Design a binder for this molecule. Structure first.
Ligand code: CLA
Ligand code: CLA
Ligand code: CLA
Ligand code: CLA
Ligand code: CLA
Ligand code: CLA
Ligand code: CLA
Ligand code: CLA
Ligand code: CLA
Ligand code: KC1
Lengths: 191, 169, 213, 173, 188, 174
């Protein structure tokens, strides 16, 4: 049942790799739904982690201004230093100076509590629309700001199954990528 | 019912096999205590399995608090007596979890159809659907759980006699 | 050796929805708004008539269902704690303005935080007047539980007719039940929320001021 | 809804959070009268800050020991503090009669009745050409909507400087 | 049928809107008492007497704290009427004892009229026939309005007379300067 | 819907090599047309606002009580925005916000079966009612705005990286 799920494709020869197959032959359909959801979600953070690393290895901090002296991708220095935390004194310019792995250690503890709360709200909507409302699409969390999912409808169309397979795969690229990009931050292992 | 197979010979007793291993004979002396015994074996088994991982993992990595460090407590064997405010919060929330099982312990016989040790806890869905390897999945929990019951006595006294790291000396 | 009371408390055919290894309580039917079958100690199945606390059983033969008493007590615990957590924070300046009464008894130079407001106004006398004003409402609203226990009233639990802005005037029963669930859900959270503020400020670590950690 | 007055040209009917259907028809009728009363209070409040903030004040004595000379010398939000306690008792007392009278009309505005009309002097305004009163009710609400932002800006400028860019170096603030 | 004042409760069965201030406000069911010489007749006579005593007590305080004591009693000089009683008792105690025995004969006769008016049916509770100007002769709708206005002003004065006793026995000032104290203390 | 809308011209008929018109629903394409047109109208005012501020022509005479218009005419227009006062940029950011708040809250939104955003103030919109003439006119707004989108990216690729364009980067303003 695992070898006729969605995420298999040509790049392993249209069959899932056998060690990853070995954990889910004799398992429930809720088990393949759980691992599909945890694969997409791990791909979802890892895709954001690349651009969060690309603006951290560069100096594309706030404020964003594509002209010169505007802290854009071309000239990454600023003149305004928009003050991420006023009671701390830290600006966005201070974050882009140190390092990729030093960046999260300048963010205050109340700054992560704003992030982890609305992420805590979002993972509650994600659990409700996927598991309680038992949606047949893995990773379908009801979030579609532009209405891509109103296409034909519905999910049994070529444009969404192509988009579903492109999402898992671009999350599959970014999962090893952030693991390899944070590897060079940890250890020289760029083999 | 599910734990009585083998071949698994008993060490320091080369004739006895573990198939229907019951030399005192609790199954024939008091058969009505047998669902209480399976619930007690699995609870002894599941607590000893986390005790084995919990005895060797704080040897290498510690939680980032600075009262749990290696400079604060180098040995794992005195962490129970060195962090008392950490133990009441483990004891307090287990006490809540154990109190919600008293109406399940009060109906362990033929009251309602809950199998002993079954807490309906399978969020990752790893219980197989076909029944003939559900029993070996139950047997794997019992054999790994019985082994960790033996091992945590060897891990603790292996560290109480010889203060050392993981394997032992 | 007698017939066990266990059988009369649990359903024994259905499981509890929130705690799946436990059998469902006999009174939890899913009809009440916050009902997810959560009763691991089976306190809804206690056969005592709890309206005896208001009017004793020896006065006359009456009996209130335990789930009716528990929901009336849950809703009163919900609505008190929603106001209390809001009232603790508004008089501490958690929403910007340190809201105080115009009298100088209640000023911030007299009572600096809401932590110190109880003992300061039991001694002054504001809390004794509140206990008269609350106790007057509790004698005039608590007597409907005797009317329900006698089988005379069809009132739901926590169901005074207090809709002064009429949010539920022409509404259907599943949107009333949704609105009753949001009262219960925000009330259950504010009961734990008042438990946080009243305990974290009471530790010897301190921080009587917001954010109370 | 759009047949109601306050719906106008740029955003009408403006209700993105769908608050009009959060209650019944009587809830919306309470929302309209509260918007109308918040509007009329703030239009008196925006103008009372603009007039007393300049220096326009009545000639003479407000009380036996408090003149209007000392109250106009202060910013208005603390000029209320130096009003005598018998002065606020006279103001709050007539507002109490005004709020009791407009509530005690024979049909409540929450039940379809009239919104608060004038108490003293009690000019009748019933047959004043419903087409012209339709346009003037929209200009009452729109000037109410703007003055409620205005008086909330005046208090925000009086305590947090730079909250509004047009009132930074204003000496009344 | 539900109570008007408490619409979540059923109407008390002995209250049917016949009396003047009846909006069904009996949550404790005290109108159902019929045992220790006490019933709805006794409670209505007690309400009406508590109404009329408290109504006279409020204007009896507001007369002295505005215009001073009566002539012959100018020895009071205190705005606190709980303290001004003891200056009249200190100097002319015989007139208070004159009134207290004159009340004692009136009240013992009123106690007989209550229990004989209850056993028979020829006396409404609180009725003494004291209508010398004769408001009760015509316009029964306008006479029931006076019966309701007595009860409405009497139930209000019950709080006022109990308050002026208690905030006179605790502040030792007087009712009208307790009122001015509260106005300056809670002004915003 | 991509056949029945403007933007189709003669060099490239329906240029969509990634097929992003039929990727979503018609609300996704209606968001895309409202985002091409809004990017068009900003970049058309951006290409004009760069050239008439690089040509040196300016308003008389004082922008603020401290900042003249002529002091911003000397520097490059991408660095003149840094010298606009903070109260002036707040005046710009408020009227832009109040225009974006109005166009997304005027009735029958563009992602629904509704019109694209029109002039906030004053509301006339100057549109021809002739559908054979209007369709060509909004075909002219798009590709003029398409060229202005490439143009303003060329103005910021000449002010950041020296070079990158042959007919610029010899000019002390671009
Ligand atoms: C960035 C703003 C923008 C947006 C929202 C659109 C949207 C659209 N274009 Mg337009 N287009 C643009 C810029 C844009 N275009 C520019 C700058 C040019 C000149 C090269 C064109 C030239 C053009 C032609 C000739 C045609 C269209 C057409 C369309 C429609 C087809 C549906 C589609 O595929 O959406 C596109 C989906 C998007 C999400 C927008 C693209 C944004 C990409 C994905 C971001 C990455 C781009 C990448 C960074 C390269 C830019 C390099 C940069 C440095 C220059 C759609 C409304 C067709 C049409 O109107 O049919 C009637 C049509 O025939 N476009
Ligand atoms: C952790 C995130 C994650 C999760 C939950 C999954 C889950 C899944 N993958 Mg995916 N995959 C991933 C990352 C992940 N994958 C990465 C990084 C790649 C390389 C691009 C792939 C490439 C891939 C292909 C080609 C296919 C799958 C398939 C699947 C499904 C079948 C089971 C399986 O093969 O994996 C088993 C999952 C695990 C064993 C999870 C444990 C992860 C490690 C082992 C835990 C230990 C980590 C260790 C402590 C330290 C890290 C070392 C590590 C970085 C090497 C399952 C839904 C198949 C499919 O889609 O069928 C429908 C399939 O054909 N995966
Ligand atoms: C659980 C609710 C609750 C309780 C017990 C308190 C208790 C207190 N408040 Mg707080 N307060 C609350 C909520 C609460 N508050 C809320 C929701 C607000 C609005 C944000 C406030 C706003 C507030 C201010 C501004 C101040 C206080 C202050 C106080 C203290 C003295 C008040 C007093 O004695 O005057 C007596 C109060 C009254 C007579 C008010 C009427 C109370 C009614 C009779 C209660 C029952 C009505 C209820 C709302 C609805 C009935 C439902 C029923 C019909 C079914 C006291 C500790 C003062 C203080 O000392 O701060 C440090 C102070 O200055 N409160
Ligand atoms: C006292 C506040 C108040 C109230 C009760 C109303 C009520 C109403 N407005 Mg009005 N409105 C207000 C202020 C208010 N408004 C202000 C200040 C503006 C200018 C921004 C407007 C602009 C406006 C327009 C253009 C329209 C309305 C309309 C309506 C009706 C909408 C239906 C509804 O149920 O919404 C109920 C509204 C509320 C319950 C508001 C309460 C306050 C909310 C809950 C929190 C607001 C906090 C806010 C974010 C703080 C901002 C600070 C401010 C200074 C900017 C309703 C009668 C529509 C109408 O008149 O149709 C007949 C309509 O077209 N309003
Ligand atoms: C120069 C400008 C001027 C203007 C605009 C007016 C206009 C008016 N005057 Mg005239 N008046 C003027 C010069 C003026 N007068 C001069 C110079 C004198 C002195 C000779 C007077 C002496 C005068 C008298 C004696 C009377 C008027 C009245 C009127 C009103 C007649 C129409 C009406 O009945 O509407 C309806 C009325 C109004 C819209 C006015 C509202 C007044 C509010 C409600 C306050 C009421 C206060 C009042 C003292 C209350 C007393 C009773 C209370 C204690 C119970 C009209 C508003 C008459 C009037 O108002 O009767 C109703 C009236 O009796 N005026
Ligand atoms: C609750 C009612 C009540 C009580 C207990 C008092 C008590 C007092 N008054 Mg006050 N007073 C009252 C009402 C009351 N008054 C009223 C209604 C007014 C008019 C507004 C006043 C105006 C007043 C003035 C001006 C003064 C007092 C003073 C006094 C003090 C000395 C007078 C005295 O002892 O007379 C002795 C008693 C009598 C002479 C007879 C009492 C009346 C008899 C019992 C008839 C009652 C009939 C009943 C009302 C209705 C019929 C009952 C039945 C048939 C149904 C005394 C403490 C004086 C004082 O010293 O102030 C400090 C003073 O100067 N009183
Ligand atoms: C409130 C109840 C009350 C009480 C307890 C008294 C008691 C008294 N009055 Mg007073 N009196 C009262 C009401 C009262 N009066 C009222 C309402 C008036 C009309 C305003 C008077 C007018 C009055 C006069 C003119 C005189 C008295 C006098 C007296 C004293 C002797 C009685 C008398 O005249 O015998 C004979 C006696 C202490 C006499 C007295 O001693 O005055 C100082 C006296 O001359 N009374
Ligand atoms: C793309 C947006 C944009 C932005 C952010 C700026 C920003 C600036 N301009 Mg520039 N400018 C622009 C486009 C822009 N401009 C356009 C399209 C024109 C031609 C009208 C100009 C002509 C211009 C002159 C002559 C001057 C400035 C100046 C300035 C500086 C401060 C004063 C000001 O903001 O008034 C700028 C005024 C506007 C941006 C008005 C256009 C927007 C209106 C409200 C909407 C459409 C109006 C209407 C249809 C007619 C004009 C559109 C079209 C015909 C061009 C500031 C850096 C001053 C400066 O210091 O130069 C160095 C100055 O003297 N601008
Ligand atoms: C002088 C008064 C005045 C005011 C306060 C405005 C204000 C506005 N106009 Mg402008 N406009 C004006 C005169 C004015 N206009 C004149 C005289 C013309 C030439 C007829 C225009 C032509 C114009 C166009 C073409 C547009 C605006 C737009 C706007 C809005 C945003 C533009 C901006 O940020 O500035 C804003 C509400 C924008 C709008 O309504 O769309 C979002 C827009 O596209 N205006
Ligand atoms: C119709 C009402 C109206 C008035 C009455 C008014 C008045 C002033 N504006 Mg103007 N203005 C708009 C409208 C009005 N402005 C609008 C709708 C926009 C956006 C399109 C706009 C844009 C800017 C910018 C960029 C600046 C600006 C300024 C000033 C300042 C003159 C110098 C000063 O006295 O400070 C005076 C008081 C400058 C500034 O504030 O410098 C700190 C400045 O840089 N404004």
């Amino acid at each position: 049942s695992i070898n006729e799920a969605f995420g298999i494709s040509i790049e392993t020869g249209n069959k899932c790799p056998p060690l990853g197959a070995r954990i889910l032959e004799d398992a429930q359909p809720s088990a393949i739904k759980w691992f599909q959801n945890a694969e997409i979600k791990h791909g979802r953070i890892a895709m954001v982690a690349t651009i969060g690393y690309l603006v951290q290895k560069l100096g594309v901090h706030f404020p964003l201004y594509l002209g010169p002296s505007g802290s854009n991708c071309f000239h990454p220095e600023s003149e305004t230093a928009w003050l991420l935390s006023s009671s701390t004194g830290v600006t966005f310019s201070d974050i882009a100076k140190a390092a990729p792995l030093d960046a999260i250690q300048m963010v205050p503890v109340a700054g992560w509590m704003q992030i982890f709360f609305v992420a805590g709200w979002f993972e509650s909507v994600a659990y409700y629309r996927q598991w309680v409302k038992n949606s047949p699409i893995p990773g379908d969390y009801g979030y579609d700001p532009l209405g891509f999912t109103k296409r034909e409808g519905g999910w049994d169309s070529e444009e969404l199954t192509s988009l579903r397979l492109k999402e898992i795969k671009n999350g599959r690229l970014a999962m090893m990528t952030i693991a390899a990009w944070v590897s060079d931050e940890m250890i020289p292992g760029a083999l | 019912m599910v734990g009585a197979e083998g071949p698994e010979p008993i060490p320091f007793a080369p004739s006895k096999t573990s198939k229907n291993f019951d030399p005192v004979g609790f199954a024939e002396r008091s058969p009505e205590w047998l669902p209480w015994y399976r619930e007690a074996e699995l609870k002894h088994g599941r607590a000893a399995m986390l005790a084995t991982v919990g005895f060797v993992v704080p040897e290498f990595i510690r939680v980032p608090g600075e009262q749990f460090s290696f400079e604060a407590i180098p040995k794992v064997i005195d962490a129970h007596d060195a962090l008392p405010e950490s133990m009441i919060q483990i004891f307090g929330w287990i006490s809540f979890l154990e109190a919600c099982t008293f109406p399940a312990m009060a109906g362990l016989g033929g009251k309602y159809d809950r199998k002993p040790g079954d807490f309906s806890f399978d969020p990752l869905g790893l219980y197989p659907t076909d029944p003939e390897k559900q029993k070996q999945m139950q047997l794997a929990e019992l054999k790994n759980g019985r082994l960790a019951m033996i091992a945590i006595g060897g891990m603790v006294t292996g560290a109480a006699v010889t203060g050392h790291g993981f394997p032992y000396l | 050796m007698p017939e066990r009371l266990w059988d009369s408390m649990v359903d024994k055919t259905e499981r509890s929805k929130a705690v799946p290894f436990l059998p469902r309580a006999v009174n939890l039917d899913g009809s009440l708004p916050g009902d997810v079958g959560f009763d691991p100690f089976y306190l809804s199945s206690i056969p005592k008539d709890f309206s005896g606390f208001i009017q004793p059983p020896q006065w006359e033969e009456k009996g209130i269902p335990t789930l009716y008493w528990m929901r009336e007590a849950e809703l009163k615990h919900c609505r008190v704690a929603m106001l209390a957590w809001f009232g603790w924070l508004a008089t501490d300046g958690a929403f910007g303005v340190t809201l105080r009464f115009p009298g100088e008894i209640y000023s911030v130079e007299n009572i600096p935080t809401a932590y110190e407001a109880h003992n300061a106004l039991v001694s002054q006398g504001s809390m004794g007047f509140l206990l008269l004003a609350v106790g007057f409402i509790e004698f005039c609203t608590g007597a409907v539980l005797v009317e329900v226990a006698k089988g005379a009233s069809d009132r739901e639990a926590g169901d005074f007719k207090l809709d002064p802005l009429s949010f539920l005037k022409g509404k259907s029963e599943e949107e009333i039940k949704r609105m009753k669930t949001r009262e219960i859900a925000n009330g259950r959270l504010a009961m734990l929320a008042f438990g946080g503020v009243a305990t974290q400020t009471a530790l010897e670590g301190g921080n009587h001021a917001f954010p109370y950690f | 809804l759009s047949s109601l007055p306050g719906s106008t040209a740029p955003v009408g009917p403006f209700d993105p959070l769908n608050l009009a259907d959060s209650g019944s028809e009587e809830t919306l009728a309470w929302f309209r009268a509260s918007e109308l009363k918040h509007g009329r209070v703030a239009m008196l409040a925006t103008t009372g800050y603009l007039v007393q903030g300049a220096g326009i004040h009545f000639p003479g004595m407000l009380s036996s020991d408090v003149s209007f000379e000392s109250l106009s010398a202060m910013k208005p939000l603390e000029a209320w503090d130096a009003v005598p306690d018998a002065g606020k008792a006279q103001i709050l007392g007539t507002i109490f009669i005004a709020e009791m009278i407009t509530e005690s009309k024979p049909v409540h505005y929450t039940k379809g009745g009239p919104m608060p009309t004038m108490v003293f002097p009690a000019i009748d305004f019933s047959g004043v050409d419903a087409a012209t009163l339709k346009r003037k009710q929209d200009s009452e609400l729109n000037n109410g909507r703007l003055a409620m932002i205005a008086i909330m800006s005046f208090i925000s400028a009086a305590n947090i400087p730079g909250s509004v860019p047009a009132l930074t170096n204003n000496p009344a603030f | 049928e539900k109570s008007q004042s408490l619409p979540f409760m059923n109407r008390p069965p002995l209250l049917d809107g016949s009396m003047a201030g009846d909006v069904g406000f009996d949550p404790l069911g005290l109108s159902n008492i019929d045992d220790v010489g006490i019933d709805l007749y006794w409670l209505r006579e007690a309400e009406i007497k508590h109404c009329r005593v408290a109504m006279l007590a409020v204007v009896g305080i507001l007369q002295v704290e505005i215009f001073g004591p009566a002539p012959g009693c100018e020895m009071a000089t205190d705005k606190c009427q709980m303290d001004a009683f003891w200056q009249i008792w200190g100097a002319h105690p015989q007139y208070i004892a004159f009134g207290l025995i004159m009340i004692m004969m009136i009240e013992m006769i009123s106690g007989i009229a209550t229990t004989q008016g209850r056993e028979s049916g020829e006396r409404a509770p609180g009725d003494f026939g004291l209508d010398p100007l004769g408001y009760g002769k015509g316009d029964a709708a306008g006479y029931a309005r006076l019966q309701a206005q007595e009860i409405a002003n009497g139930r209000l004065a019950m709080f006022a007379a109990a308050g002026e006793i208690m905030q006179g026995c605790t502040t030792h000032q007087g009712a009208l300067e307790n009122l001015m104290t509260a106005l300056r203390d809670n002004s915003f | 819907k991509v056949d029945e809308m403007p933007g189709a011209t003669a060099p490239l008929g329906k240029f969509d090599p990634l097929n992003l018109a039929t990727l979503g629903s018609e609300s996704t394409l209606a968001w895309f047309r409202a985002a091409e047109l809004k990017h068009s109208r900003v970049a058309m005012l951006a290409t004009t606002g760069y050239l008439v501020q690089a040509a040196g022509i300016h308003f008389p005479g004082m922008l603020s009580s401290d900042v003249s218009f002529e002091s911003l005419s000397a520097m490059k227009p991408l660095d003149a925005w840094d010298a606009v006062p903070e109260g002036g940029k707040n005046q710009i950011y408020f009227t832009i916000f109040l225009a974006e708040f109005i166009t997304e809250c005027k009735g029958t939104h563009y992602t629904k079966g509704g019109p694209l955003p029109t002039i906030v103030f004053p509301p006339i919109d100057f549109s021809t009612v002739n559908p054979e003439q209007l369709k060509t006119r909004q075909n002219r707004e798009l590709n003029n705005g398409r060229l202005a989108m490439i143009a303003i990216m060329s103005f910021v690729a000449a002010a950041n990286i020296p070079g990158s364009v042959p007919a610029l980067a010899g000019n002390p303003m671009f």
